[PDB]
Design a protein around this ligand. Sequence first.
Ligand code: QIH
Lengths: 971, 235
Amino acid sequence: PRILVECLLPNGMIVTLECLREATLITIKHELFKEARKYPLHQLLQDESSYIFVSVTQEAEREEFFDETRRLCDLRLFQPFLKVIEPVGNREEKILNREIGFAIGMPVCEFDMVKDPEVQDFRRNILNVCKEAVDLRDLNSPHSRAMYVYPPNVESSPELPKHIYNKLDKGQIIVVIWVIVSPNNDKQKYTLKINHDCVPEQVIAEAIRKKTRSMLLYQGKYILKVCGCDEYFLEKYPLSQYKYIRSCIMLGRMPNLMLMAKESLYSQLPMDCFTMPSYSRRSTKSLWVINSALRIKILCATYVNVNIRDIDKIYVRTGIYHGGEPLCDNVNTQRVPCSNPRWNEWLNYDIYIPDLPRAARLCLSICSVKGRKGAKEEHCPLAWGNINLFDYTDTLVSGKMALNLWPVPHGLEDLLNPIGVTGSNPNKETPCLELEFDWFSSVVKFPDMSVIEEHANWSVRENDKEQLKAISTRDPLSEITEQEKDFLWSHRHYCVTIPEILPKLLLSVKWNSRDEVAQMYCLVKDWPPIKPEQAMELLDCNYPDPMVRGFAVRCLEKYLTDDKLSQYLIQLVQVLKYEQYLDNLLVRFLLKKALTNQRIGHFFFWHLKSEMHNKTVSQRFGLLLESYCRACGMYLKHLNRQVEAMEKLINLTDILKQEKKDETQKVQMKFLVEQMRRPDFMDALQGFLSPLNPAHQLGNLRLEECRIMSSAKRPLWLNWENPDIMSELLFQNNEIIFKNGDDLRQDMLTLQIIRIMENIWQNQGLDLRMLPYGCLSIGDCVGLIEVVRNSHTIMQIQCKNSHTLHQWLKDKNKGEIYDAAIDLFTRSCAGYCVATFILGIGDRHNSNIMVKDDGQLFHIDFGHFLDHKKERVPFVLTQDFLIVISKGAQECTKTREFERFQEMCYKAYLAIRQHANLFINLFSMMLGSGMPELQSFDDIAYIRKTLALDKTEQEALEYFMKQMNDAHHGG
Amino acid sequence: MSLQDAEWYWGREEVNEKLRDTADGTFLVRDAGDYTLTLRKGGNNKLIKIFHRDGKYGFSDPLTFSSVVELINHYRNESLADVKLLYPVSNIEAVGKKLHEYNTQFQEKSREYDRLYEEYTRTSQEIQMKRTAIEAFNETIKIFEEQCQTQERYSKEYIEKFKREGNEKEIQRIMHNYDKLKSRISEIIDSRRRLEEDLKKQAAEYREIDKRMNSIKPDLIQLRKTRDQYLMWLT
Ligand SMILES: CCN1CCN(c2ccc(Nc3cc(Nc4cccc5c4N(C(C)=O)CC5)ccn3)cc2)CC1
């Protein structure tokens, strides 16, 4: 309503405008100038359409609302005051910056404030990647822009597994082409039987031949769309290579397609305009010549939050590291009383300066001392901080430095944290620590590549050949003995023939040396390529060398397909944090991929935004999000639609979470209905692309079916319509669960791992079907979960004896469908038995397992994905499950159904156990993600144990058999 | 000599914990014949597998040395070259009562640490919000100061007393706005000072919350060792 805004005219006189809460800026400005006439000095004031507004929002940013039609509600103004001043800046730049700031979550002016030369150089240099991506997109318009907007959702290889191939009708699939070409939508359906290797062009040609009575002779004028969703077959791929088509083949469903005019989507595609922002306009000695042991001085820690009585003394542990393995033993500073944290000591390290690796670092930690306990005086690290020994331009840090030490992470028993951010804590109340380095009377830089490849090149049977392969096949998380390292380095030259041995030979190199590192460089320069699943290892903390990671990124670019890149994307985004600098090859690759494909880009943005609330990776991810949104194209307008939408939900839950968390769900439901009936909530929620899948569009909310669940966290059961014309084909209603306060990165990881397991088993020929449904974390403890429909929890089915579930399954599939309803049930049951045994998912009661009416069985909630509750078969097959698998009997355990079931389980288990490196990598690259249950190497040691990697194939199979017999009481 | 009872022998997490921040030359032999020896050198725990073949033990072929204890003794006598193997790492009712008491103590320490951590994170949230509000107040006060400067620059020139035009506008209107404008600027400055004072108070309280945090850890980790050693006896 009337908020009594204040207006500051250019004359100076303050005017009180009684403006309603939901009012636009144009009307307010008009009323303000109308009232200004009564005020004095109205001579100076110009016409209304000659001045612009300025205000300060809740983010402490001074911004000019140029013409924003959003009411003063959406302004988010800090105080109800508005100054009037003649506009100075460009409307385009300010509007784009405002949109970018809303999408990112932090105003873009902050990056302009940051004075760090590396930050400014990255900001001005990522524009090169942005510009090349934008140029590539507009190379072959409007086709290229269309492919960018609606990318081909296809598989990795055209060749099909034999089982699905036999599922086809002799290589012919029966699709249905819907044509709505008429004055009114009539949905002319044509049933067309065509090969599974025909490109969509031939599909359309043969559709035209049919539609036209029985023949005609359209071409280059129509395209194919998936009815009920926004996915288009614009690419020249075999019709069965698209994910929807192959999913329909596997699931035994008719692919219902649609014929749409090309000009329809070409005109539906707004033109993207990328404009270079304002900021784009703005004695060396070889490091090997210097010969002196590295020395660094510690001066004083100005601020320290310690207790004098509880802490006797303090000292600064230091180490010269490379990855996580010290180059030389840690040096220490003499203990001093906590009151006077001044040391002024020149620590001397054992590492000869020329032998410094490029990825070297200096990890410092201020920690106390307490000798009261006795012989083992406990040490606690008060604060930590890392410092790269080389600048982004290959220069040794010299002179003095002031480092704000981050707080020690929870659970970090050790004293030095060599994996953390290599930068000063942005917060200025943090404990500073002053440092000084040596001065060499000149700038010292790492020697140029050509210089290194001259040192090396001047400083240089089956009895062993089997050992190399045995090592290479070994886990990357296993242990390597010194004889193994010496053996590998002795046969470094011969290791080229085994290209998959770099992840191991790298550990065999002494980074403390110069000849060894030079030879390793000359080797990695001419290394045969490796697989992307093996080049994701070379992109972890273990391997921080510039050239190693450059080679790994080259392999990723050359061989990583978009389908894989869209799956191993969480891991790559997370590994972005552990990169040394801001301008590196991996970020360029990921940014180009995200800018040349909106399917990858949407999840790229959402992952970055989710991880951009931990202050450690706030700045880097904010810079990257700015670089993306500058050249994101028009998708910004969509992303904002999602962003604010989620906000409108978040706040609501909070109001229910604590404010009204006093009465039962009746009052909560009434309040939810009342708040949803408000115009703001109704207008914000409806009409936007679903974050889980951008293809699905959410229409008017069906407030009738939106309720608050009975689950402990009390999530939101949000129900939406489908605005698409052909919604009846796929699904007329779209449902989602909004969970506030529950971490959803654990569920995301488990579902990604289940998807990878399903892919492995499909390739192996084991048609085990699982539901790895959608799940996103849009922040911290806030998330969206897909709702699977027509599926009832096992508790409900039993509630609605040991035969209740089987009786229900028989009822839902009366007739010949019983065979399929039992086969699919058993296959899914085997798949989850193996999967939840290997990953040790939390113990399963009835509520966590639900079955579709068809027969499939899936587990819904997760959050114990490495058995962190202090092996531990969670999915012990209940009596009802075995009765259903055996088709009903009292001698169940003695039927051929058991034999087939156990054989499929063993096949799946062995197939997974043959691909343990991938799962170990996926779990290890996300150790720092901060999940409550993936936080120490024992968590991945559990995976190593369950797969029985140490044992042999027969031993592992016998171990799984023993575990099964123990779990389901023998069999 | 006999095995299964020795200082070096122990029969990976435990090995790493024992060798963590240990002196150079330390060596611990444990099974993973395997008989893997973990030796601390260069700040890192190197591993050497003791090969057992033809009833003979040895680091590298030939396995001339006879017994694992013989290997340990011989390489304690002389350096491994290049580092000598220096100093190695080696009632029921009462134990039950001690275990119960230390379990209770560990639960108390964990609860206290959790409460301190939650208070720390909360106070950090309010600290950040208050700092942002203070910066917004600074910006608003700067804008108001600019407005006041412009008003003072303009009023005298545009419309001073009756000379140009001051019959009753300056007394009733011209000076009314200038004083009315100054009322809000002063109050805005007042709000900044009041909120700034609160921020300093929270910093001290947030400071104190850290003092209790950086003292409980020494008294809780040592609790784990007492709990770990007593709990992991069960004999
Ligand atoms: C013999 C084999 N050795 C040597 C190689 N080693 C190793 C394996 C994988 C990674 N990758 C990684 C490491 C990350 N940090 C952490 C590294 C070590 C411990 C912890 C980490 N935590 C964080 C950051 O929360 C939890 C505790 C984060 C992401 N990825 C790094 C080192 C295993 C032991």
